[PDB]
Amino acid sequence: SELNIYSARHYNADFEIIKKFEEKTGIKVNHTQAKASELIKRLSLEGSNSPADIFITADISNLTEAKNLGLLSPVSSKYLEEFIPAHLRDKDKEWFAITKRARIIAYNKNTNIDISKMKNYEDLAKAEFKGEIVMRSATAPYSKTLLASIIANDGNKEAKAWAKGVLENLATNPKGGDRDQARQVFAGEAKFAVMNTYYIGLLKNSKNPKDVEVGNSLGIIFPNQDNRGTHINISGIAMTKSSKNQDAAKKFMEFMLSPEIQKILTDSNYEFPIRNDVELSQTVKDFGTFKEDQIPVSKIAENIKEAVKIYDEVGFR
C-alpha cells in the first residue's frame, strides 16, 4: 500500500491516470472517493493517524478549508512551481491546481431563446427569470464557491439578494448535480442551468446516447463578459499532514502536472489544463473563448463562511 489518496473528484477518467502512475513508478495507489465535506471530517477525526497521503478536490474552497484546519503540509517542488502559475497555487505551498473549470450558464441552443438579458451572474436572480432557472444544492462546493466569488466582487448585501432571487427563481427544488440540471434544460423544464464547462464535454462524448443528445443541445453563456469575466474554479491537490509516504505523494502531485496527464485531463475529462503548453481537446476548443475573472481563487475562498451563512439565511437546505 504505497500511496493513499482521499479524493472528492468524481470522474471515470481518473482511473486511467492512476493506472498510468502505478505502471510508471511501481507504487500502488489506494483510491478513496467521497464528498469533500466527508473527507475533511475524516481527516479531522483521523488526524495524525490517518493513512491519507494526498487530498484531491474539485474546488478551491475545499482545499483552503483543509489548509486552515491544519490538515495539510507544504510541498516545495520546482516542478510544480515552474508549470503552475502562482495565482493557481497556495502562497504557503499547501495546495496546487491540477485543472481549471468555468461555472457558466447553459441554455438549449436547439430552441429560439433570447439570451440578451442573461449576461451576468446577477441576472439569474432577476424576477423576469422566475421558474426558468435550475441549480444544484447550495451545499455543493461549486455552489458555495460561486457565491463566495459573488461576495468577493459585489459584497454580502448583493450576494444575499442574489441567493434569494435564485432560490425564488428555481424551476424545481435542486436535484442531482450539474448533469441533471443540463438534462432539465434539454427536456424543457427550465431555460437556464448553472453548470461547469467540462460536463458539456462529458455529456457530448458519453457512452450513453441519451446523454449525447443532452450535451449536443447545450449552448454556453460565459457570464460577465462585459465586465469582470467568468467564474473560474480549480480541481486541486495537496499533501496531507498525516502523510507517511511523502516521497510518493510529491511524485504523484508532480505527475498530475506532467504533459501526458494534463493532456488526458482535457482530452478525456474536458477540463482546462493548468500547463500553458498543452493543447486543449477539440471539444474544449468548441466551448469557445472567454474573459476570465482575474480575482485570485485564494481570495474567493476567504469568503466561504459568508457564502454558507447567506445560503442558510435565504432558505436553501
Judged by the rule CB under 5 A, the positions of this chain that interact with Fe ion are 58
Asked whether 190 and 184 are in contact (CB, 8 A), the reply is yes
Residue 280 and residue 260: Cα distance in Å, rounded?
Answer: 12
Cβ 11 to Fe ion shortest distance, Å:
7
When the beta carbons of 123 and 211 are compared against Fe ion, the nearer one is: 211
Asked whether 39 and 13 are in contact (CB, 8 A), the reply is no
Any residues with CB less than 8 A from the CB of 284 and at least 6 apart, and which? 197, 198, 201, 266, 270, 271, 272
When the beta carbons of 58 and 301 are compared against Fe ion, the nearer one is: 58
When the beta carbons of 56 and 75 are compared against Fe ion, the nearer one is: 56
Cβ 196 to Fe ion shortest distance, Å:
6
Asked whether 175 and 118 are in contact (CB, 8 A), the reply is no
Asked whether 53 and 5 are in contact (CB, 8 A), the reply is yes
When the beta carbons of 13 and 113 are compared against Fe ion, the nearer one is: 13
DSSP assigned state of 27: P
Residue 296 and residue 136: Cα distance in Å, rounded?
Answer: 24
Cβ 210 to Fe ion shortest distance, Å:
20
When the beta carbons of 88 and 234 are compared against Fe ion, the nearer one is: 234
Residue 159 Cα to chain centre, angstroms: 20
Cβ 178 to Fe ion shortest distance, Å:
7
Cβ 48 to Fe ion shortest distance, Å:
30
Residue 112 and residue 219: Cα distance in Å, rounded?
Answer: 11
Residue 268 and residue 281: Cα distance in Å, rounded?
Answer: 8
When the beta carbons of 54 and 195 are compared against Fe ion, the nearer one is: 195
Cβ 46 to Fe ion shortest distance, Å:
25
Cβ 269 to Fe ion shortest distance, Å:
9
Asked whether 150 and 135 are in contact (CB, 8 A), the reply is no
Question: Could you tell me if residue 31 is left (phi over 0), alpha (psi between -120 and 50 degrees) or otherwise beta?
Answer: beta
